[PDB]
């Protein structure tokens, strides 16, 4: 059947919407991006830290988020010349405003009942909670999907997402799927260039490529306890943010802004490489998705730090890097409806396999 | 099949758990009450007003609430000698910590995914949101169930808050919240005398109704409104009463009359031809209130629901088990003429075990 996937990630630039065909395999039929207004982005970010009157504030933010998603679903279907009735379900991640696996909770907002009401399509949502409920991290959730797409018993491969945050799926033949967050992907580089130069992202990693890696700063950033931990682990804005970076910066004389940028690129390269190679030293292929796949300087640094492996963007495997996550969530809606597991216990640390999500019928 | 119903209401004394048999009709098979600890009750109440760090605080409260519910489900099933596999689903209301239909939102907590994980049973939950999403009040939700059981008569719940279902032959089901049931009388006696409720309405029966206070309390805009309407702790609370504010027992007597009058006047305004009023909730055993309801509605027979085969205390739990059955059968759970929603809607969300 046909499934919609709805993802809104860490960057908060806008919503990813995806149409997939799901039978024996997964086929991307269509994709649609809708920018998020500055107001909504800032209001979401304000909910990402503890604050006053959060229940009402989140309820009102969630309305606008859902109205925008429904709008985006309408636009995709019209542009593809198909009616809501031709889609079996929308797999909606919602929007993470808090991720505290160590306190046994994770918060994705996005009122799925309103989403079903506005789209007239069945909604499967809230995928992370049942994994956390089973003792797991609730993240990353793509591994099972990466496994469905790229699982091959000839070669050991890692499927790496570089978004705001980085995460990897380790597909070792004959062994259970493993994986975890590696740490910051684009989140720090975006925040640094936005703070200094007013731009949302560092195009092709060019500002970073114009500076010099500072070894002292790099070592102290890699000293964060998160990078040392192994096995199931997940992270978010709670750990890696701009105040976090500036605390490491305030201990030492003012450094050139482009050099801080260069260092942050290397932090992402090194934290990915070291955590990946620690878990799958026999890695032969690294398949890269998310925005980071088109960061030239990062894709080059990843190639230098993992010489034993072929580092390549996921587009030369038939899957556009930007749409992988949306597709995963459409696929999770299919998995829910078929009563098939969505998590990987050796990824999240959950007690066992679980059916993820909840069903809100149209 | 068999369904569990899980309700935790306004009073926050504890959780109602219900087992029903559902085929052509609804049969109560078993019921189980589990008290809520003082800590959890107070922590829930703290979330019923705006405050700091609510996301994390609610996540942690919800975890204790679910753990207690799972514990109560385990206890019921053991005591009834049946395994989790014999139950098709749990209908869980969760716990209302905010109800703002005018701002198009209502907040019931109670992590249904954790509930399915701990019980090993499928969970249907979050019943109010789809109705609010369709333009409705999201409350009251019992009317459709009251209609399935008792379908001219009014079916009246007196809990912390009062609500009525008006079952007029040949006409669509109507209904609304009438206002405070026991909530204010409980709050007043707990504030003055330290007791959780006014046993049989005896403290109230010992005082004199104050006409002046009564009139000013009935002057609240909510009592004047008609058609679909819902309320909660946001409107009727102890600071609300004290703003309008005499001997303490006289205030109690007045509060009993407020409940009697607001129920009577709103009921009779909507269904003047009412012949039978079937009363559920704790208020059904408040003697002085059940007498005052009989005085104010002479045209109607006012009777507790137990003499219709349904114990007053378990009606709500049964409604929510029934709503789980309705979800799974893809049948509507709201009444558009009750809630004001745009049309009939399948209520709730399914969290498979
Ligand atoms: C709590 C949360 O939303 N985590 C995100 C984040 O974004 C990337 C990474 O960190 C991953 O763990 C997850 O998202 C992707 C879609 C996932 O679950 O696979
Ligand atoms: C928002 C909310 O939880 N309302 C409750 C409350 O308690 C009684 C009454 O006011 C009713 O409107 C509702 O619960 C019952 C179970 C209902 O929806 O029918």
Curated annotation (Swiss-Prot), chain A:
Gene3D superfamilies xref list: 3.30.420.40
Entry's Gene Ontology BP terms: 1,6-anhydro-N-acetyl-beta-muramic acid catabolic process; amino sugar metabolic process; peptidoglycan turnover; response to antibiotic
CDD domains in UniProt: ASKHA_NBD_ANMK
Catalytic reaction equation(s): 1,6-anhydro-N-acetyl-beta-muramate + ATP + H2O = N-acetyl-D-muramate 6-phosphate + ADP + H(+)
Amino-acid biosynthesis keyword on record: no
Annotated ATP binding sites: 9-16
Associated pathway: Amino-sugar metabolism; 1,6-anhydro-N-acetylmuramate degradation; Cell wall biogenesis; peptidoglycan recycling
Phenotype of gene-disrupted mutants: Cells lacking this gene accumulate anhMurNAc. Deletion of this gene increases fosfomycin sensitivity. Growth rate is not affected.
Keyword set includes NAD: no
EC number: 2.7.1.170
GO molecular function, one term: kinase activity
Keywords, in A-Z order: Antibiotic resistance, ATP-binding, Carbohydrate metabolism, Kinase, Nucleotide-binding, Transferase
UniProt cross-references to Pfam families, sorted A to Z: AnmK
EC class (word): transferase
The family this protein is said to belong to: Belongs to the anhydro-N-acetylmuramic acid kinase family.
Protein name: Anhydro-N-acetylmuramic acid kinase
Source organism per UniProt: Pseudomonas aeruginosa (strain ATCC 15692 / DSM 22644 / CIP 104116 / JCM 14847 / LMG 12228 / 1C / PRS 101 / PAO1)
Gene name of the record: anmK
